[PDB]
Amino acid sequence: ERDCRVSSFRVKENFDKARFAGTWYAMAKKDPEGLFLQDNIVAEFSVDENGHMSATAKGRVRLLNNWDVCADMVGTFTDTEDPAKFKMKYWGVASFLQKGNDDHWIIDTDYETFAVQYSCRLLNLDGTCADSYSFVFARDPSGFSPEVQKIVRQRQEELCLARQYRLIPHNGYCD
Numbered sequence: 513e514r515d516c517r518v519s520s521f522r523v524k525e526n527f528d529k530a531r532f533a534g535t536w537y538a539m540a541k542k543d544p545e546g547l548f549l550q551d552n553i554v555a556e557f558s559v560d561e562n563g564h565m566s567a568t569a570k571g572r573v574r575l576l577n578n579w580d581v582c583a584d585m586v587g588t589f590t591d592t593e594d595p596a597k598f599k600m601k602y603w604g605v606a607s608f609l610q611k612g613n614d615d616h617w618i619i620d621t622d623y624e625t626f627a628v629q630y631s632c633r634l635l636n637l638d639g640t641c642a643d644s645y646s647f648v649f650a651r652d653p654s655g656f657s658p659e660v661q662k663i664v665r666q667r668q669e670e671l672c673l674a675r676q677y678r679l680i681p682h683n684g685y686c687d
C-alpha cells in the first residue's frame with residue numbers, strides 16, 4: 513500500500529523559520545470538517561529575535577449562520593523535536609472567530625516560491641488522518657511554474673490528499 517499513516521509523513525528537513533518569514537499567498541487548500549477560511553487567504557509569518565515564530569492570516573469566512581466576514585487570525589507556534597513540526601495556537605481579532613490549537617507541519621518548501629502545509633486534527637485508529645487540512649502557499653499570487661506544480665503534486669500525494677484540493681480566489685474582499 514501507499515502509507516497514509518500521519519506518523520510516516522516526510523516533512524521539510526532542516527526547516528528554517530527565518531527564511532520562511534514574510535508573505536505567503538494561499539493558492540490552494542484541502543478543507544477540514546466544520547468552519548474554515550474560504551478564500552482571499554494571505555498569511556504573514558514572523559520570527560522574533562528568540563526564534564519564536566508567529567503569523568497573522570486574513571481570509572474571508574462564513575459563520576455558522578452563513579453570514580460573511582473577513583477574519584483576522586493570529587497564530588503563535590511552539591517548536592517541537594521536529595524543526596518542521598509545530599503546535600499552532602490561534603485565535604481571531606474578533607471574539608466570535610474560532611480558536612484552537614492545531615498541528616502545523618511544513619511538508620515542503622523552497623522558501624522562495626512555494627510551501628505545502630499540513631495539519632491533522634484527528635487520528636484514525638489505524639494512524640491515518642480522520643480530519644485534515646492543508647494549504648498550498650506561494651510567494652507570488654500567480655499560478656506556479658509547471659515544474660513547481662509537479663513538486664507540489666508529489667507532496668499532495670505523500671499526504672494521501674491528491675485530488676482533494678480546491679483553488680482559492682483572491683479578489684480583495686478583506687482589504
Ligand SMILES: CC1=C(/C=C/C(C)=C/C=C/C(C)=C/CO)C(C)(C)CCC1
Pocket residue numbers: 547548549555556567568569573583585586587602603608609610611616629647
Ligand atoms: C492562524 C493561521 C492559520 C490557520 C487559520 C485557521 C485554522 C483559521 C480558521 C478560521 C475560522 C474557522 C474562522 C471562523 O470562526 C494558517 C494555517 C493559515 C497559517 C497562518 C496562521
